[PDB]
Amino acid sequence: TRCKLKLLRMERIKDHLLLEEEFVSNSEILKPFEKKQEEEKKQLEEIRGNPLSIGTLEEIIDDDHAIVTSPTMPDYYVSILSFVDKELLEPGCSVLLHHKTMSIVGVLQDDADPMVSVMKMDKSPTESYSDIGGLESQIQEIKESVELPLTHPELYEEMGIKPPKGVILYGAPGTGKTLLAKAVANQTSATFLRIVGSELIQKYLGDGPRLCRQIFKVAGENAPSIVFIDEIDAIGTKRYDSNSGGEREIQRTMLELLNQLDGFDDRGDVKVIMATNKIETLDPALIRPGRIDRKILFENPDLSTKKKILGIHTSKMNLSEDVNLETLVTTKDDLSGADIQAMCTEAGLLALRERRMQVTAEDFKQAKERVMKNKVEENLEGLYL
Amino acid sequence: HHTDCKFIRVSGAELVQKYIGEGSRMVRELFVMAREHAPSIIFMDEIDSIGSTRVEGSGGGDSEVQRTMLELLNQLDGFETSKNIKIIMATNRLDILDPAL
Amino acid sequence: MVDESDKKQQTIDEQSQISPEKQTPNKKDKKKEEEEQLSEEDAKLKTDLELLVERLKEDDSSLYEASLNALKESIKNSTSSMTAVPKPLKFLRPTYPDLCSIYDKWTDPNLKSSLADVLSILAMTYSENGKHDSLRYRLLSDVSDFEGWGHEYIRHLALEIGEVYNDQVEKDAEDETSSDGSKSDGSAATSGFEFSKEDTLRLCLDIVPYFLKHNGEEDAVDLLLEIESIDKLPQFVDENTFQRVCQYMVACVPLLPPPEDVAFLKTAYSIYLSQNELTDAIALAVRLGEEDMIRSVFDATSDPVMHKQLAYILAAQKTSFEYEGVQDIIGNGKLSEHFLYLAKELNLTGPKVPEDIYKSHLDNSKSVFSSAGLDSAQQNLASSFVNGFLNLGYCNDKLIVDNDNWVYKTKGDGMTSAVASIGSIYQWNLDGLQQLDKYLYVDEPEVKAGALLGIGISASGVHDGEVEPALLLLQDYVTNPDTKISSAAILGLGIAFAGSKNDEVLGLLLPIAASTDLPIETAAMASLALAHVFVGTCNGDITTSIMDNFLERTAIELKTDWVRFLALALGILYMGQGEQVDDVLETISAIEHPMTSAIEVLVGSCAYTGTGDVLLIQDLLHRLTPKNVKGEEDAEIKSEEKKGKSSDKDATTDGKNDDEEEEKEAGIVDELAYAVLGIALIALGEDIGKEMSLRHFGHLMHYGNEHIRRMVPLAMGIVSVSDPQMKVFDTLTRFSHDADLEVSMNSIFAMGLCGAGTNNARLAQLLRQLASYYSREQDALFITRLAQGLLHLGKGTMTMDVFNDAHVLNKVTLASILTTAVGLVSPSFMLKHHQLFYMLNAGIRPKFILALNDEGEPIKVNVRVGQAVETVGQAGRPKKITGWITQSTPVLLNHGERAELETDEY
Amino acid sequence: RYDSRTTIFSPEGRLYQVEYALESISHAGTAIGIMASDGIVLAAERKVTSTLLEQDTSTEKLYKLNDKIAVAVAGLTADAEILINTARIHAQNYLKTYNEDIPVEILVRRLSDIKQGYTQHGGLRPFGVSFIYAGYDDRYGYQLYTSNPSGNYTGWKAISVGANTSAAQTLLQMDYKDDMKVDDAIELALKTLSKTTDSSALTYDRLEFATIRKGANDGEVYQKIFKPQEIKDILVKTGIT
Amino acid sequence: AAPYAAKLKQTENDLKDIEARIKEKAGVKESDTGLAPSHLWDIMGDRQRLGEEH
Amino acid sequence: TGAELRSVCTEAGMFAIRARRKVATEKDFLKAVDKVISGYKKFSSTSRYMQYN
Amino acid sequence: GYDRALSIFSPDGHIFQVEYALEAVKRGTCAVGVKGKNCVVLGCERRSTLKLQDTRITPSKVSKIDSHVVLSFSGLNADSRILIEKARVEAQSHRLTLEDPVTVEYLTRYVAGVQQRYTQSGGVRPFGVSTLIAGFDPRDDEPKLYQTEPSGIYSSWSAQTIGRNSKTVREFLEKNYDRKEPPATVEECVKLTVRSLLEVVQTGAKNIEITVVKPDSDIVALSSEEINQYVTQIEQEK
Ligand SMILES: Nc1ncnc2c1ncn2[C@@H]1O[C@H](COP(=O)(O)OP(=O)(O)OP(=O)(O)O)[C@@H](O)[C@H]1O
Ligand SMILES: [Mg+2]
Known part of the structure; x- marks a missing residue:
């Protein structure tokens, strides 16, 4: 309790005093510059009238003119002139005209699409780095290809050459792969895009590769950026339709990836992570190196490792009353870290029947049996016996 | 009725989007609507006989709707305090389902 | 649930869920009729207790409320609690939960309020018996489950917390207040608090503080010592006990004002001293900053053991770690007295052994040059200083210096600063003196003066054990009557010894700094040096410094620069204290002038430090006031006004900085931002005021040790390219330095863009160039922090020269000052008896998980890295020792401290 | 996908066709053996019935394969029919050759091969029959086994x-007694058959019964199939009717 | 659950203050770039603005 | 492929970072070719009847 | 891939039906073989499905084919059952021809032979059973251990493990075992077997079954009591 408070002490005072400051300061910002700034405001105001007719920029010709196509429909041969530059104007941007004579009075707008919402994440994970605990030899591997050449470029010029491009995290289910992508991206504070590979298939034909253009068009502007393609195993035999998604599309989406990630485009400075549960499902040319470099293989966590993973989950819990925690790990052999999170889930479910608020040691032993029974089928030892 | 949630039935439909017009990139949208009208129950009925080209797809595309929905839901677990947007999945038998559902 | 009578014992429990027949009818009637039946009630008490225990499993509000409803009445209605005197008193044990069932299980606002008061009174009276303690205990360690007890047991505990807090706020105290109705002290509730504390320490972590801070007394804390020192190893390990203890100071660190805060931290120190680890003792003793506490831990290892043992070696190491040198002076001479060996012991305490370890690190890091090749005009001057800035700390670049060509092409004030920059190549090194000597005996006086500055810088790493002290060289120069020579000499002496107030050093500086009648601009260095000397330790608030400041104001006001430097010097002097600095604020304010008011706001920051939240609001009202007054109208003076405005801006920043280091630890992100906005008020309130606030922002960040270092310096930097004063960039880079070439790259590109891009004045260009080279040290040679590193709540003494320079418009004279920038952090290595220079392995940790720490006791998982690496800055700071699998045991625990590792292999 | 012929495996080393053949079994009625040292009861339930289905003139879920080994049938009765004939023919072949009524083990092991054989060789369908073999041989006394359609056996x-x-197994092991009585074994079979079966009243006509005993007169082995009226009376005793 | 429960409640009051700061801060904006050269273009552009040839 | 030839240079180079040597030498090239050849068989399909003989 | 049928080859050169046949072996009970110098011990996990399962009449996982060769299996129990009987008709027939008892080297070929035959053909699936055949020669007293696999390939190993998490026992075995000196005392060699089998049962001393072959047509099945004493030695030392 008194440890919690020390943290709670700094947090309250400092930000709430800054809030009280910013509130008073809204006024105060105007006061030191009110004759450069209101002078500028005046001159801005005078040329552009009201309203500001928004058009969408098709293209500029570099000579101080442009062709715009408004949404209100008419096309106009505008001038690039006044409070606007040729470098600020790039296709697909939304430009500000003055209504009565279309002169480009500025640009204040580039994005407003529903599409780009999809790619970005407003994320807040409940497990951050150092709740990836154990398998530390191989977290060290994802660091070297994602985290550490962002954090020090020093090391990758001290060795010379390029920093290795991308990675594939692959192996058995439950091995903590998801939590890796979300947690290494916590460390860096890079833009975490996330798209699934069951969302890379589309219910419209030939829109699938257009979507795959969107992922690294987004990546490239918000860079440095970490693009998670989660579950790209779903490319080989999982598809929404056949006469309006079809066979053509599945192959095309993969062709599209090639051009994005090491085509002319090249698109340097996007770290790519691909989680896939089977790398023998994946395309031979997407498991070509030099767009995803080295592969990291994970396996069902080993006997000492599952100590780590049991401590991560039972730190939340009220602990064992008699303690048999060290023997739980021993009984399990060749088993996932997802079995460990389903075991502390299962212990507190048995506890949840009572609608008691404590948890005791004995629930652990029961809960392990319950969830092992669920795994094993009646035709496995039907087929066998 | 007891929890006081909007029971929003989803099914993969093309009728629940007037904008994108399909249920593939309406998995993202589902979360944001259900977030305005929280707390909510998402009843994604995996009927796996609903379609006509979805059933031809992979035996049913509805499994694909559920796998995207799970993960999205996993990364924000405390976006209002705990959860709130409950994913009720339903299928005839669990033979019909994938090893990863 | 439903009644099923007395068929079996199971159904008796169900019967009493709706209506008890052995607690309600029978007992009630019994008490209200015969008094021979008091004997029957006494036996039935045990039975009644059991029925509560069995039905503790049940949780529903209705079947505790109604069941015990008429018992709750009986207290005053029939029994009156005195119809049989002892007998209702000892029968208060079942009736006390009955009251709590209306407090907490049922919520009826009228009764919940009223019966809170009733519970407090009866808790006190029944703690005389000592059975109210046992009542709490059966729910604290539990016997059964319900939602109810988990909230209920606190309601009993809260009664105690309530009263004790109230006796301070309202002076009347005791049971005179009807908010508890229970006496504050007296031997009936005091024994209750002690017993309660015991149970709640074991199972919880709870009421143990509420009692301490509410008592407001160190006495409360000293009771705590007794109980914990028993617990130190048999109940749970040393480590677990410690996490409670360093916490004892930290949770209420930012909420014990000066006389309270010191008095509490005495007790945490003593707890550590009592326990096994003396390593924990030294950390807290440094914190206090008192000479007395340092000596006690040093004595404890040195004096009792006649033999050399581990003990003499360990003593020397512990005192060595502070590079203030405050511990260094004190610990020396005991080694000489004991006389096992002089030679090893004296050297090891001094910062002489720190020179040797640097060579091993340097071998890995090598040398990479990148210094400017520009020559002629002001660009010659720029480049020659830049060479020293890239070779800070011990570095070898002898041959370049020996090419006297570029050296002689410096001119004016440039000559002085050029010789000073040469000295920073051999910063923290015995050798280097040779290069300085050549120039010193030839040519104009200008090179002579610059030699003395360079001696200062070099002497930082060697000034203890009576092995070439700075005092020895520089005394001769002070004697010499020339102003340039003497001023340079005493500046260098202050730097070298740092926080050390040795008799020879202090007493040289004692008659002087008392002439300001004669008008000399460069006599700023008189007080400035003495101020630097004082920091790192408790301050006498010396009468020499206070007198001369007043005298200067009387004599002159023409030299605006002189009086501005003087004002800052007083405020820096008082650092290392805050209790005594409350007194001197009044003393300064006794004599009042508008000029004197400028001095006051600076000194307010130091007095109020580690307590500032009254200080914060003050330093914001001050900002508002010029404009506010103009507002009123809207509906000699030059010097006084300007000093006024500038002082305030500096003071605001300073207040925030000292506060953020000592305090809790989350808040650090936030305090940087308070600056951005202070500047923002400033961004449309004073036009003149903007100039000062730009420069302050960078040193705000460095002092404060901000968590975020990527986004904020870079973003601010862009705006300030347009704005005048390129000295803004210099102040940003001192923060950005961090662990080199993580943060500091973005700075090289960004600062390099504005500098290379725009040339429109060689004056403007010069500031930009110096800043860029400062930021990086090749291949992570060393890091600079304002903080001690030994404590991350600490603050240095060598970095205070950096902090001083950002209060004034840039000047060539200021360039001479900026060469000094000392503040080195050592790279840890595992030591042996043969003084091994290699670390085996370490874990490095970017972000502590632990919510059982702020500082973060390093996790035992970490990420593993190789031998012989620099102690990483932010995003690497928690450091755990990996050596345990190769079975090596640290003697000196390291948490990301500056301190060198030491291990014992068995 | 792998739900085809028998040569092919699934990449998980499953032959889908043995797995489905198991599942065939629970679409025909419950069949229970309970072993006791006093005798074995075999009890069975009818898959469905109507009010003019004759089932008092013959059995058709209890067949004698010989004069000491008899079988209860659960599963497709067509698949059953051929395998019962093959078992019975072999039972007498053993009689002719050695002058002993065939051991329980030799007979189960034979039929386990035969079931296995229709899966392993050719294009022929696997069998989807579970026979509870209840026998006597003078080696092991009383013996219970059951054989999977998979083509293996367990005692x-x-x-x-x-x-x-699943349920019928659970209620059986809950109230099982190690030594038991023959009489109790008959009672525990009606008790279980009531809760598992979705017929409202449990009628004599939904039951077939046979008992194999050496304790109904020693020196000799007596196979006693219960007639409708004996079945009808024992329901009374246990008070279901 | 009073020792952790109370303190948890104060943490939620803090977050709300923060979100409010993003809203408060966003309230100056004011992001029109055209710089120092385009102070000349605004005279030029008043004449193009009443031009019928654009 | 020359993509694999880029996987000897990169792979030899992260062993440079970990050893706390700035240069690369021959020995770290030896491990680097062996890691890429041997890892390549695992990703690709191989289910031999030579895992007991 | 090319699992649609057995006879068609595969770009990858691996007949899929054999590969999946192996996978099936992991279903069944673990069996381990360890040779001595004067012993071979052949032990197997005897996994108990329910407590209603007899020990009166229920088959052991280890089957003697002839009076001095011993055989365990791992795999599809249904399939093993005819494989063991076919092995046996030939085995006995070996004496019909030569008036010599069955040689272990002739026997492994034969068991691999029935299996190879089934794979070669298209109108049968392979056996989903790998077997360990342990024994000594009649003529000589050096211990011999063989394996057959689904494929129809046979090997000799010093010690070898198959079925139910075979990998983990295999590695365990390497570390413990010495090829310079195999244990030359029957008891210590048994003990090595028990330690292996402990692992896969997790807990059991009534689910570990040990069988031993010794030279000159000695084959014995070990008492449940006798195995528990060995487990007692292994738990105390640990
Ligand atoms: N080494 C570990 N440390 C901590 N927690 C672990 C560890 N490994 C696994 N886990 C826990 O197991 C959970 C389940 O695994 P997770 O969702 O990350 O799957 P995965 O292996 O990527 O599967 P797929 O991607 O095929 O769906 C993790 O979220 C985490 O809580
Ligand atoms: Mg995953």
């Missing part, structure tokens, strides 16, 4: 096949 102290295998 038991109690087993349930047919519909509602």
Whole structure:
């Protein structure tokens, strides 16, 4: 309790005093510059009238003119002139005209699409780095290809050459792969895009590769950026339709990836992570190196490792009353870290029947049996016996 | 009725989007609507006989709707305090389902 | 649930869920009729207790409320609690939960309020018996489950917390207040608090503080010592006990004002001293900053053991770690007295052994040059200083210096600063003196003066054990009557010894700094040096410094620069204290002038430090006031006004900085931002005021040790390219330095863009160039922090020269000052008896998980890295020792401290 | 996908066709053997019935394969029919050659091969029959086994096949007694058959019964199939009717 | 659950203050770039603005 | 492929970072070719009847 | 891939039906073989499905084919059952021809032979059973251990493990075992077997079954009591 408070002490005072400051300061910002700034405001105001007719920029010709196509429909041969530059104007941007004579009075707008919402994440994970605990030899591997050449470029010029491009995290289910992508991206504070590979298939034909253009068009502007393609195993035999998604599309989406990630485009400075549960499902040319470099293989966590993973989950819990925690790990052999999170889930479910608020040691032993029974089928030892 | 949630039935439909017009990139949208009208129950009925080209797809595309929905839901677990947007999945038998559902 | 009578014992429990027949009818009637039946009630008490225990499993509000409803009445209605005197008193044990069932299980606002008061009174009276303690205990360690007890047991505990807090706020105290109705002290509730504390320490972590801070007394804390020192190893390990203890100071660190805060931290120190680890003792003793506490831990290892043992070696190491040198002076001479060996012991305490370890690190890091090749005009001057800035700390670049060509092409004030920059190549090194000597005996006086500055810088790493002290060289120069020579000499002496107030050093500086009648601009260095000397330790608030400041104001006001430097010097002097600095604020304010008011706001920051939240609001009202007054109208003076405005801006920043280091630890992100906005008020309130606030922002960040270092310096930097004063960039880079070439790259590109891009004045260009080279040290040679590193709540003494320079418009004279920038952090290595220079392995940790720490006791998982690496800055700071699998045991625990590792292999 | 012929495996080393053949079994009625040292009861339930289905003139879920080994059938009765003929023919072949009524083990092992054989060789369908073999041989005394359609066997102290295998198994092992009585063994079979079966009243006509005993007169082995009226009376005793 | 429960409640009051700061801060904006050269273009552009040839 | 030839240079180079040597030498090239050849068989399909003989 | 049928080859050169046949072996009970110098011990996990399962009449996982060769299996229990009987008709027939008892080297070929035959053909699936055949020669007293696999390939190993998490026992075995000196005392060699089998049962001393072959047509099945004493030695030392 008194440890919690020390943290709670700094947090309250400092930000709430800054809030009280910013509130008073809204006024105060105007006061030191009110004759450069209101002078500028005046001159801005005078040329552009009201309203500001928004058009969408098709293209500029570099000579101080442009062709715009408004949404209100008419096309106009505008001038690039006044409070606007040729470098600020790039296709697909939304430009500000003055209504009565279309002169480009500025640009204040580039994005407003529903599409780009999809790619970005407003994320807040409940497990951050150092709740990836154990398998530390191989977290060290994802660091070297994602985290550490962002954090020090020093090391990758001290060795010379390029920093290795991308990675594939692959192996058995439950091995903590998801939590890796979300947690290494916590460390860096890079833009975490996330798209699934069951969302890379589309219910419209030939829109699938257009979507795959969107992922690294987004990546490239918000860079440095970490693009998670989660579950790209779903490319080989999982598809929404056949006469309006079809066979053509599945192959095309993969062709599209090639051009994005090491085509002319090249698109340097996007770290790519691909989680896939089977790398023998994946395309031979997407498991070509030099767009995803080295592969990291994970396996069902080993006997000492599952100590780590049991401590991560039972730190939340009220602990064992008699303690048999060290023997739980021993009984399990060749088993996932997802079995460990389903075991502390299962212990507190048995506890949840009572609608008691404590948890005791004995629930652990029961809960392990319950969830092992669920795994094993009646035709496995039907087929066998 | 007891929890006081909007029971929003989803099914993969093309009728629940007037904008994108399909249920593939309406998995993202589902979360944001259900977030305005929280707390909510998402009843994604995996009927796996609903379609006509979805059933031809992979035996049913509805499994694909559920796998995207799970993960999205996993990364924000405390976006209002705990959860709130409950994913009720339903299928005839669990033979019909994938090893990863 | 439903009644099923007395068929079996199971159904008796169900019967009493709706209506008890052995607690309600029978007992009630019994008490209200015969008094021979008091004997029957006494036996039935045990039975009644059991029925509560069995039905503790049940949780529903209705079947505790109604069941015990008429018992709750009986207290005053029939029994009156005195119809049989002892007998209702000892029968208060079942009736006390009955009251709590209306407090907490049922919520009826009228009764919940009223019966809170009733519970407090009866808790006190029944703690005389000592059975109210046992009542709490059966729910604290539990016997059964319900939602109810988990909230209920606190309601009993809260009664105690309530009263004790109230006796301070309202002076009347005791049971005179009807908010508890229970006496504050007296031997009936005091024994209750002690017993309660015991149970709640074991199972919880709870009421143990509420009692301490509410008592407001160190006495409360000293009771705590007794109980914990028993617990130190048999109940749970040393480590677990410690996490409670360093916490004892930290949770209420930012909420014990000066006389309270010191008095509490005495007790945490003593707890550590009592326990096994003396390593924990030294950390807290440094914190206090008192000479007395340092000596006690040093004595404890040195004096009792006649033999050399581990003990003499360990003593020397512990005192060595502070590079203030405050511990260094004190610990020396005991080694000489004991006389096992002089030679090893004296050297090891001094910062002489720190020179040797640097060579091993340097071998890995090598040398990479990148210094400017520009020559002629002001660009010659720029480049020659830049060479020293890239070779800070011990570095070898002898041959370049020996090419006297570029050296002689410096001119004016440039000559002085050029010789000073040469000295920073051999910063923290015995050798280097040779290069300085050549120039010193030839040519104009200008090179002579610059030699003395360079001696200062070099002497930082060697000034203890009576092995070439700075005092020895520089005394001769002070004697010499020339102003340039003497001023340079005493500046260098202050730097070298740092926080050390040795008799020879202090007493040289004692008659002087008392002439300001004669008008000399460069006599700023008189007080400035003495101020630097004082920091790192408790301050006498010396009468020499206070007198001369007043005298200067009387004599002159023409030299605006002189009086501005003087004002800052007083405020820096008082650092290392805050209790005594409350007194001197009044003393300064006794004599009042508008000029004197400028001095006051600076000194307010130091007095109020580690307590500032009254200080914060003050330093914001001050900002508002010029404009506010103009507002009123809207509906000699030059010097006084300007000093006024500038002082305030500096003071605001300073207040925030000292506060953020000592305090809790989350808040650090936030305090940087308070600056951005202070500047923002400033961004449309004073036009003149903007100039000062730009420069302050960078040193705000460095002092404060901000968590975020990527986004904020870079973003601010862009705006300030347009704005005048390129000295803004210099102040940003001192923060950005961090662990080199993580943060500091973005700075090289960004600062390099504005500098290379725009040339429109060689004056403007010069500031930009110096800043860029400062930021990086090749291949992570060393890091600079304002903080001690030994404590991350600490603050240095060598970095205070950096902090001083950002209060004034840039000047060539200021360039001479900026060469000094000392503040080195050592790279840890595992030591042996043969003084091994290699670390085996370490874990490095970017972000502590632990919510059982702020500082973060390093996790035992970490990420593993190789031998012989620099102690990483932010995003690497928690450091755990990996050596345990190769079975090596640290003697000196390291948490990301500056301190060198030491291990014992068995 | 792998739900085809028998040569092919699934990449998980499953032959889907043995797995489905198991599942065939729980679409025909419950069948229970409970072993006791006093005798074995075999009890069975009818898959469905109507009010003019004659089932008092013959059995058709209890067949004697010989004069000391008899079988209860659960599963497709067509698949059953051929395998019962093959078992019975072999039972007498053993008689002719050695002058002993065939051991329980030799007979189960033979039929386990035969079931296996229709899966392993050719294009022929696997069998989807579970036979509870209850026998006597003068080696092991009293013996219970059951054989999977998979073509393997295990010995038991109690087993349930047919519909509602999981529940019927659970109630059996809950009240099982190691030594038991023949009389109690008959009672525990009606008690279980009531809760597992979705017929409202449990009628004599939904039951077939046979008992194999050496304790109904020693020196000799007596196979006693219960007639409708004997079945009808024992329901009374246990108070279901 | 009073020792952790109370303190948890204060943490939620803090977050709300923060979100409010993003809203408060966003309230100056004011992001029109055209710089120092385009102070000349605004005279030029008043004449193009009343031009019928654009 | 020359993509694999880029996987000897990169792979030899992260062993440079970990050893706390700035240069690369021959020995770290030896491990680097062996890691890429041997890892390549695992990703690709191989289910031999030579895992007991 | 090319699992649609057995006879068609595969770009990858691996007949899929054999590969999946192996996978099936992991279903069944673990069996381990360890040779001595004067012993071979052949032990197997005897996994108990329910407590209603007899020990009166229920088959052991280890089957003697002839009076001095011993055989365990791992795999599809249904399939093993005819494989063991076919092995046996030939085995006995070996004496019909030669008036010599069955040689272990002739026997492994034969068991691999029935299996190879089934794979070669298209109108049968392979056996989903790998077997360990342990034994000594009649003529001589050096211990011999063989394996057959689904494929129809046979090997000799010093010690070898198959079925139910075979990998983990295999590695365990390497570390413990010495090829310079195999244990030359029957008891210590048994003990090595028990330690292996402990692992896969997790807990059991009534689910570990040990069988031993010794030279000159000695084959014995070990008492449940006798195995528990060995487990007692292994738990105390640990
Ligand atoms: N080494 C570990 N440290 C901590 N927690 C672990 C560890 N490994 C696994 N986990 C826990 O197991 C959970 C389940 O695994 P997770 O969702 O990350 O899957 P995965 O292996 O990527 O599967 P797929 O991607 O095929 O769906 C993790 O979220 C985490 O809580
Ligand atoms: Mg995953």
